[PDB]
Design a protein around this ligand. Structure first.
Ligand code: FAD
Length: 303
């Protein structure tokens, strides 16, 4: 557990469930604006007093307090790290998460059911101690290649690892802190949310787009405000279909990396769109994609 640093460049499992790192909540800020749907909080934790180090694209576990319905201790839940390795204040002292409160239906006994860890995290007060494990994950890592093209397909909290890439790529303080990574490639974020007030980190994403118009393109798929051509609500798969030929042309570049993150269910529609585009040039997308995965250029993390 605490002895867990005898390997690689990528930090993994510095802390494990049997002896987690006890961090303190610094802040818990709301990301969904009035008129939006649900509760998504940006939570920042203090890492001082421990040796938790991490990089962009990784996740950490949070062990919530309490026991389940069988009286057994609650197990950890994984959350994509929402901050760069340097933390939101670029001081190498914190870590942030983007947590949506899970809440649902009646055909699952009772009435409104609240997710255990997500409700715990979203209502947590500053100063509270939290059990943190990790980091974990080697599937959503960003290439060190500054000339890479990075396609990001995200829905909801799937924006979390995207925020770590984008901040590392475009924030002034990040560029001053990472001399070795001066991004000059092209990044395209297609972000699906139900409403405008639900666009997590809207002000900052749009700020990046304004400062870097040739290096970053921002595309939204807002279901309660936009309709696709078939008359249905606009989802991320619809924007992908809309730009399938373009996305396929970018994917053909040897330097292109594609990242997919969010709730499970988005993948099938994205593949269908890219398959139709790939087919025009006599390529079977399912086969091409396996090669991309093997080459480490197709990154997916859905849950
Ligand atoms: C790698 C990874 C990264 C993740 N990153 C994030 C992140 O950045 N942000 C974030 O918010 N979450 C993230 N998640 C999901 C997160 O780990 C927890 O699953 C989620 O927060 C819910 O946990 P809970 O403790 O709130 O719910 P639980 O109390 O554990 O309830 C979960 C159970 O409720 C059920 N369920 C789920 N949705 C519904 C629904 N609408 N209808 C019916 N039943 C349902 C299932 O039985 C599920 O097992 C990530 C998951 C993984 C695996």
């Amino acid at each position: 557990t605490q002895a867990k640093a005898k390997h690689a460049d990528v930090p993994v499992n510095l802390y494990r469930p049997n002896a987690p790192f006890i961090g303190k909540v610094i802040s818990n800020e709301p990301l969904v604006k009035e008129g939006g749907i649900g509760i998504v909080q940006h939570i920042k934790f203090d890492l001082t007093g421990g040796n938790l180090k991490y990089i962009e694209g990784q996740s950490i576990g949070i062990i919530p307090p309490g026991v389940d319905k069988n009286g057994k201790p609650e197990k950890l839940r994984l959350y994509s790290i929402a901050s760069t390795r340097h933390g939101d204040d670029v001081d190498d002292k914190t870590i942030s998460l983007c947590v949506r409160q899970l809440e649902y239906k009646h055909p699952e006994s009772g009435e409104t059911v609240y997710g255990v860890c997500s409700t715990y995290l979203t209502h947590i007060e500053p100063g509270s101690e939290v059990k943190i494990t990790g980091p974990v994950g080697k599937e959503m890592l960003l290439p060190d290649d500054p000339e890479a093209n990075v396609i990001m397909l995200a829905t909801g909290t799937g924006i979390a690892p995207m925020r770590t890439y984008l901040w590392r790529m475009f924030k002034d303080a990040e560029r001053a802190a990472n001399p070795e990574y001066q991004f000059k490639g092209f990044s395209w974020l297609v972000f699906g949310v139900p409403t405008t007030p639900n666009i997590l980190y809207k002000e900052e994403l749009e700020e990046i787009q304004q400062k870097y118009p040739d290096n970053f393109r921002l595309t939204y798929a807002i279901s309660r405000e936009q309709k696709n051509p078939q008359g249905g609500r606009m989802y991320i798969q619809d924007r992908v279909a809309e730009h399938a030929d373009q996305l396929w042309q970018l994917i053909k570049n040897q330097k292109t990396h594609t990242y997919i993150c969010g709730l499970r269910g988005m993948e099938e529609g994205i593949d269908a769109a890219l398959s139709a585009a790939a087919a025009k040039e006599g390529v079977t997308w399912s086969d091409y994609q396996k090669d991309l995965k093997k080459a480490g250029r197709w990154h997916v993390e859905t849950y």
